Symmetry: C2
Subunit: 221 residues, 2 copies
């Protein structure tokens, strides 16, 4: 998944190019528009998580374009590119809700950082037996105690928890854990289940079982 879908609205083509190349290189899915009409069309087609728009635009300024978008039910937060001479006059429009701005001449570092903050502001614990996971941060706990897991062990633990009680064959685990990218020996699944038992299945009762010839299952006996 991309980190977010961003729509860039600016009538200056070289700034559209710069912003989208940067954002794409940072892992964002970027869509573009050179005016208000193109902006409303792209926002309906691509449903963005954030909008970057230049306040200075031909015909209709960046506030007007944003009003129209918001009237169509597009509620994504916005980042304005704005001139410094107009700051005390425009401050109310520039920072309402969860919107923010950068002033010209701007840096890409700043654009990216202010974008991540508005995305975080706009966003509004799996348990099994004595195991707990946070899907957001990837922290794992075992009887209250922090456990350090690699990205693959985490994915593997989550897959077992979400499917607690289901017998999961090596091929099903292999497809899921490496997202169909990997098609080599299933005994990699055997290694990972082994690492994962060594880190989280260390209590009185065995939680992670092998049904020999068939698969693995997580069940509190």
């Amino acid at each position: 998944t991309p980190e977010a879908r961003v729509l860039v609205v600016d009538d200056e083509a070289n700034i559209v190019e710069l912003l989208s190349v940067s954002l794409k290189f940072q892992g964002f899915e970027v869509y573009t528009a050179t005016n208000g009409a193109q902006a409303l069309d792209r926002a309906r087609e691509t449903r963005p998580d954030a909008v970057i728009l230049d306040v200075m635009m031909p015909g209709m300024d960046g506030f007007g374009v944003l009003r129209r978008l918001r009237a169509d039910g597009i509620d994504a937060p916005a980042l304005f590119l704005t001139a410094r001479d107009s700051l005390q006059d425009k401050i109310a429009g520039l920072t309402l809700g969860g919107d923010d701005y950068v002033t010209k001449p701007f840096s890409l570092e700043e654009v990216v950082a202010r974008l991540r903050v508005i995305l975080r502001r706009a966003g509004k614990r799996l348990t099994f037996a004595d195991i707990e996971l946070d899907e957001e941060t990837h922290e794992v706990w075992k009887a209250g105690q922090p456990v350090s897991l690699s990205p693959t062990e985490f994915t593997l633990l989550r897959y077992f928890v979400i499917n607690a009680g289901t017998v999961l064959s090596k091929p099903k685990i292999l497809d899921h854990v490496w997202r169909y990218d990997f098609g080599g020996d299933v005994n990699v699944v055997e290694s990972y289940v082994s690492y994962l038992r060594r880190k989280i299945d260390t209590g009185e009762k065995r939680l992670l079982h092998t049904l020999r010839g068939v698969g693995y299952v997580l069940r509190e006996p």
Copy 2:
């Protein structure tokens, strides 16, 4: 509170301390300054600032450390950081926690001032007055008369608010004059007569008279 806000500027670069305080003072901020963390903690206790501006890059102890210590002493004012662009992705959590914000170097004064006003507003955590068919908002200064907006000058507003808050009390020209012009003005009391007259012409119109003259004594806002 005379000034728009008390601001403490913490930076080890003297020409930037100078620039910032001159601009801020010219915008009507009361400004205090420090060149290091020890002077920062001392000035914050003496002057109880509403906001702190601090450079992240400082000798010995960086700007986060100085802020941690101010905050442990109970100084909870929001902070604006002056920060380099190279360190944004690494420092973003410290730079925007709570109601803090930042500007990147090289910065404009417009931007510093704007971001400061926003943090000050965010840190200040509605207010209405009524009498008969008159209504006031102390926040925006809007006035209404039988539902109808009425446009008052700042003085007319202060005057109408004074009457409403003291409805029923006979207020003499000297008391009115002292309050309306904050003791700054001590000239002829017939200025009070003029303003009462302007005020009566805007909010005291026809039917029952709400604003009365007790001749030789003063004015009172009361139902007839």
